[PDB]
Amino acid sequence: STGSATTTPIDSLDDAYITPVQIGTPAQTLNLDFDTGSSDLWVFSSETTASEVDGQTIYTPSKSTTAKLLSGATWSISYGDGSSSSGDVYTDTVSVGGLTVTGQAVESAKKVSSSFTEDSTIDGLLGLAFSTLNTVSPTQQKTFFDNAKASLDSPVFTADLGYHAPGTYNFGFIDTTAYTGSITYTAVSTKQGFWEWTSTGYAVGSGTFKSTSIDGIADTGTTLLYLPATVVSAYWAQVSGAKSSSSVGGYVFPCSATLPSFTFGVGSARIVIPGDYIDFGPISTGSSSCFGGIQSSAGIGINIFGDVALKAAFVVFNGATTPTLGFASK
Ligand code: NA
Numbered sequence: 001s002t003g004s005a006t007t008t009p010i011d012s013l014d015d016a017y018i019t020p021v022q023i024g025t026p027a028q029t030l031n032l033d034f035d036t037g038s039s040d041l042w043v044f045s046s047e048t049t050a051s052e053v054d055g056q057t058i059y060t061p062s063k064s065t066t067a068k069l070l071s072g073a074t075w076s077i078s079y080g081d082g083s084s085s086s087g088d089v090y091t092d093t094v095s096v097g098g099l100t101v102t103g104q105a106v107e108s109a110k111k112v113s114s115s116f117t118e119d120s121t122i123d124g125l126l127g128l129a130f131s132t133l134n135t136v137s138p139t140q141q142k143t144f145f146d147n148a149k150a151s152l153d154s155p156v157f158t159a160d161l162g163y164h165a166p167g168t169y170n171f172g173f174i175d176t177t178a179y180t181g182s183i184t185y186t187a188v189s190t191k192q193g194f195w196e197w198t199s200t201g202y203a204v205g206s207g208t209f210k211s212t213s214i215d216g217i218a219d220t221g222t223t224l225l226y227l228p229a230t231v232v233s234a235y236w237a238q239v240s241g242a243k244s245s246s247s248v249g250g251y252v253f254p255c256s257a258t259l260p261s262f263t264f265g266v267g268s269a270r271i272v273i274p275g276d277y278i279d280f281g282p283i284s285t286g287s288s289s290c291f292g293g294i295q296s297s298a299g300i301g302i303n304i305f306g307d308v309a310l311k312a313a314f315v316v317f318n319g320a321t322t323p324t325l326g327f328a329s330k
Contacts, residue, residue: 001151001171003099007034007161010121014282014307017161018121022095023106024064030123031245034169035221036159036195036317037052037304039133039143040077041094041133042085042107043124044116044220052112057122061108067092075107075135080222080300083115089136093094096126099171101148105134105141125221128157128317133193145171145319155170155319159220160330161311163277179314179328184269188323192302195317197325199305200267202227204235205260209270218310218317218325224280225262225273226297226304235262235294242292248283251292262294264309266327273312273313 007017011165018031023043030043044053046060067090076086087110094104109116109124116122127134131142147274149155152172160178161167168178189196194217203209232251236242238260242253253259259275278293293308316326 001099001148002170003095003097003148003289004168004170005097006166007169008166009162009164010119012164014161014164014311016122017167017220018123019096019126021126023059024092026063026064027058027095028059030059031121032124032126033122033221034126034128034159035219036128037217037219037221038077038079039123039127039129039131039193040075040107040135041105041124041126041144042075042087042109044112045087045108046086048109049111052117054117057123058196059108059124061090061092064092066102067106070105070136070139073105073136073139073141075137077135080304081115083113085109085112085116087111089141092216093142096144096171097169099148099152101144104144104147105136109134117277124304128220129195130190130193132190136155144153145317149319150174157317157319159310159315159317161220161307163274163311167311174316179330181329183314183316183326183328184266184314185318185324185326186266188325190323193304195323195325200265202231202241202265203263203270204238207238209263209265209267212305213224214264216297216305219304219306220310222304222306224304224306225294225308225310226300226306227294228303229296229298232294232296236292245289245297248289248291251290252283252289252296253290255290257290262304269327271309271313271327271329273309277312
């Protein structure tokens, strides 16, 4: 089997992407944030504290003839941005882009933190990291990918995120029309439960490539590119008037600037992030200070190749016995 679903930016900045997901019988379609940095499929629901729901579409298990309580199971998660959610668990039928899994753990939120409530466009998360990070207790549950894997034509999914445009998540096949040149594959460590890999270096604009190992994660659920402070300083030093602002919480730059590109290495191959992808717009409405899309990972404890990086590539998440990542230009 295969599946193919369109993923759509939630706003004009590409802060996140939503993908429609069918849950239950008859189908309830929710727009979920596919997150290769976490491993829980959780939804706003009929159980969610009423004051914490503001515009989201909810899953109502009592209206699904295939829903079953997973008795005694609870979940609770905290993300890198300080957000959180928790609740209880149902199993139900879940379909993405025509690919169906029966018996998927659907984590029903009883509580969500303020950033989830405040984002009316995201109805929940669909985790695509390794199932070892799933938070369900006392019986850990599998991701949608892990439950689909054995049925897929190939044990893979691909992320093809758009810049200010829709893109695609595919399950079970490589669309050889969706990228240019060849795909470069690179090793993955699963030891922290992430799609963790080592970039071979970077360049800023038309500058020379610096060969250096940068360990980090491929994380569709993180907006920005978080890299070591040395690398980030070298990038923003090429932008007149850019500076790190402790008050704003990262590097800012004049909205009048034209940003240089940023290149990262994948083995001997190179992915170029256009300068425009690094502009996250005014820090507050009408400001002439703009927020940068490359930020320091110092204090986060890991480098994160988030959407800024991933949307410059066609990315293969290879879930074969020995996982690997692949990157192609597009
Ligand atoms: Na922000």
